[PDB]
Design a protein around this nucleic acid. Structure first.
Ligand SMILES: Cc1cc2nc3c(=O)[nH]c(=O)nc-3n(C[C@H](O)[C@H](O)[C@H](O)COP(=O)(O)OP(=O)(O)OC[C@H]3O[C@@H](n4cnc5c(N)ncnc54)[C@H](O)[C@@H]3O)c2cc1C
Length: 456
DNA sequence: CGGCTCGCGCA
DNA sequence: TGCGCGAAGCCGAT
């Protein structure tokens, strides 16, 4: 409804009804940013057509107890900057604590909202909140895909087996959906503390903090500055300094040649469409430009496709039949080593390369992309069962990665353990036909000793 | 039937 | 280091 630079294919109606006379309320969950936000822009256009103001509601759930301080501070500090950014545009931001299924419905009734808009996320918990909200509200409810360049329900209607099947589909719809972002218009009609919730949450997560021998924290919070503004600087530095050499050095953990955009992209502090727009105009190495675009467009959005069309995305049942049969037949194979969650967590294994990868995960919260494959695949090799390996890999990924609890993580773990979006390889013990990685293979691609010595 | 985001031999 | 084969099941264009 309404909009000249707005594609209607980015919005879908979750619930029909009579449009109320109150303000249009935007339920911000995934895209925590002010600029290049389709969901916020569409909420403004609906408000403009109805001559009502637009407001933003963020519901703080109990999910931060499962995660750590590193994710809590990163999200909270970005929200504090976001509050000022919306305030400059005369857009009020309301922060609620509790279950969104009950808090959002209460806010709609109390604030007398006219229309409700929310961003899209294929996670299981989001669909549970939406269904609860729908039964408690009586105004139209819309969903906007502000995370993907091409809407998830529009790119493909089925689960995609491999990237080479999804690649032609995505690139065919690029000329339509890849476009510039109109500026956010400030509100014409004007009508909890973020510091207190930060202090309250931190005290609850203090006992669960990872520590060293001398009770010293392992996490180093100066590597990534949270916030919308800092994410712009990371993109600018990557395009100017790192994008040219990305194609040749993205598989070398000893070189900081990655975009470092996943923590910002996970919380929606920067738009992946915005990154694509600046990358496309950038005149750099054609090989590196193609390599980076294949990651942020295909592999990032196919991860949303995997979780959207597979409700068991974090389970063994989502694996392909060939992988399940191979893993089933190799259940009784004697493992070379057996490690529990705690031994994996502290990095007390016989592999010095695996332990160094974990320390980078512990200290920085963002382990290098190449070593994540080795990190996850060796968990399967040294665990009781494939279910145990999937349980440990998901737990350590969500607990310590800044980009954890993301569709890119569940798809990545399933790729490493269950061969999702992959193919069969040579037959092996324990791991069967799942793709294999060895220490000697990494030794021939990068300086392993430098990586190991960098992280003890 | 062609071709997919590893190890390994060889220059 | 970069290149080409090997080992493996299956989708998708016909
Ligand atoms: C076992 C495992 C677990 C992972 N855990 C997570 C996670 O929790 N959260 C997360 O966001 N990513 C995860 N990834 C994906 C990938 O490792 C990260 O996106 C990347 O390492 C982050 O560094 P970067 O963005 O600087 O790398 P870049 O090469 O600069 O990545 C560019 C962008 O493309 C996307 N992308 C790149 N590689 C992948 C990939 N393999 N799968 C999906 N999208 C990709 C991301 O949006 C990323 O920001 C995981 C991968 C594996 C193998």
């Amino acid at each position: 409804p309404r909009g000249s630079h707005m594609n209607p294919k980015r919005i879908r109606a979750l619930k029909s009804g009579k449009q109320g006379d109150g303000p249009v309320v935007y339920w911000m969950s995934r895209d925590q940013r002010a600029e290049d936000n389709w969901a916020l822009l569409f909420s403004r256009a609906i408000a403009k057509e109805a001559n009502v103001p637009v407001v933003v509601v963020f519901c703080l759930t109990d999910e931060f107890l499962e995660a750590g301080i590193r994710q809590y501070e990163f999200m909270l500090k970005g929200l504090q900057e976001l509050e000022v950014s919306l305030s400059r545009k005369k857009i009020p931001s309301f922060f609620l604590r509790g279950d969104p299924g009950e808090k959002i419905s209460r806010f709609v009734k109390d604030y007398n909202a006219g229309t409700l808009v929310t961003d899209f996320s294929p996670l299981r918990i989001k669909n549970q909140w939406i269904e609860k909200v729908i039964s408690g509200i009586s105004i139209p409810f819309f969903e906007v895909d502000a995370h993907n360049v091409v809407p998830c329900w529009e790119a493909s209607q089925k689960h995609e087996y491999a990237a080479h099947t999804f690649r032609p589909k995505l690139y065919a719809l690029l000329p339509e959906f890849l476009e510039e972002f109109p500026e956010l218009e400030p509100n014409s009609v004007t009508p909890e503390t973020l510091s207190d919730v930060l202090e309250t949450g931190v005290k609850a997560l203090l006992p669960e903090r990872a520590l060293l021998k001398n009770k010293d924290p392992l996490f180093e919070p100066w590597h990534f500055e949270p916030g919308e503004k800092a994410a712009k600087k990371v993109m600018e530095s990557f395009i100017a300094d790192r994008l040219d050499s990305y194609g040749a050095l993205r598989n070398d953990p000893t070189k900081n040649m990655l975009s470092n955009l996943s923590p910002y992209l996970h919380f929606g502090q920067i738009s992946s469409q915005r990154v694509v727009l600046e990358v496309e105009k950038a005149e750099s190495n054609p090989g590196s430009k193609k390599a980076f675009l294949d990651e942020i467009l295909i592999w990032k959005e196919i991860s949303d496709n995997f979780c959207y069309y597979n409700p068991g995305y974090d389970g063994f049942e989502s694996f392909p039949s060939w992988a399940k049969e191979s893993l089933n037949a190799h259940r009784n194979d004697v493992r070379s080593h057996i490690y529990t969650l705690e031994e994996f967590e502290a990095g007390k294994t016989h592999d010095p390369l695996w332990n160094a990868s974990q320390m980078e995960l512990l200290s920085t919260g963002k382990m290098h992309g190449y070593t994540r494959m080795y990190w996850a695949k060796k968990i399967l090799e040294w665990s009781e069962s494939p279910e145990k390996a999937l349980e440990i890999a998901i737990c350590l990924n969500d607990r310590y990665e800044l980009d954890g609890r993301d569709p890119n993580g569940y798809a990545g773990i399933a790729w490493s353990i269950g061969g999702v979006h992959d193919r069969a390889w040579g037959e092996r013990e324990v791991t069967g036909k799942i793709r294999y990685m060895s220490y000697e293979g990494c030794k021939r691609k990068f300086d392993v000793k430098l990586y190991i010595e960098k992280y003890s």
